[PDB]
């Protein structure tokens, strides 16, 4: 059972070259279920795979939801059922994918996480895929999901603050996604801007100290922080 794991990672890399991300996610899901820890490469293969899968489902959900808003505004009555049924089917597929990711995180990855870097990576994923569920959630389920995302995000913020430099791309991307959580989901634009401001400010103070190979990843996320701040202010 420890000779199949190498084949699953091999087929995940092949699926990535072939842009077959649903197969890639299935291959990475099987690799995680083997029980061994993931390296930095294997962590990204798992994250890249599922982000593309849920990313296309989110884009489809947003398209169908905007059409549903217009169809319940304009006066289209017979158009209503087709859009509602199809948007709900895409909504179910998206929720099913997030449950798979959150299932792998809580049952394998987050528990047996060796270093702080991986634990922040996995906890950031847990907050991300709870945030994706909150994007489509409605009532009783929604309010509990928003609390679960904040708990996962906050635990990663505390670990990264004590274990990572403010220029670390994982800490930056974590705060970037957390600020979006505050703005979009938690309805806290002042906390969203404050977190984005502080994240940019503290990373800006230490920009001259950055390492050579960290330049490209860190300055990219700082641009995203500035882009959202430009949009929110």
């Amino acid at each position: 059972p420890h000779m199949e794991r190498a084949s699953l990672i091999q087929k995940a890399k092949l699926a990535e070259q072939a842009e077959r991300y649903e197969d890639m996610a299935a291959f990475m899901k099987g690799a995680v279920e083997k029980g061994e820890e993931l390296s930095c490469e294997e962590r990204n293969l798992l994250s890249v795979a599922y982000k593309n899968v849920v990313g296309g489902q989110r884009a489809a959900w947003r398209v169908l939801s905007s059409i549903e808003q217009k169809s319940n505004e304009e006066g289209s009555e017979e158009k209503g059922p087709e859009v509602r049924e199809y948007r709900e089917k895409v909504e179910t597929e998206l929720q099913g994918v997030c449950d798979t990711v959150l299932g792998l995180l809580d049952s394998h990855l987050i528990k047996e996480a060796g270093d702080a870097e991986s634990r922040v990576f996995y906890l950031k994923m847990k907050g991300d895929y709870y945030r994706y569920l909150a994007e489509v959630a409605t009532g009783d389920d929604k309010k509990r999901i928003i609390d679960s995302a904040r708990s996962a995000y906050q635990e990663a913020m505390d670990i990264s603050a004590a274990a990572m430099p403010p220029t670390n791309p994982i800490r930056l991307g974590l705060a970037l996604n957390f600020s979006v959580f505050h703005y979009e989901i938690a309805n806290s634009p002042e906390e969203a801007i404050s977190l984005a401001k502080t994240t940019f400010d503290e990373a800006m103070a230490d920009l001259h100290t950055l390492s050579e190979d960290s330049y490209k990843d860190s300055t990219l996320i700082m641009q995203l922080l500035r882009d959202n701040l430009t949009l929110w202010t």
């Binding site: 890249v48 996604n177 979006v180 990219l220 995203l224």
Partner: peptide
């Protein structure tokens, strides 16, 4: 685009 940014 006109949308806010997030990343892996």
């Amino acid at each position: 685009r006109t949308r806010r940014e997030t990343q892996l």
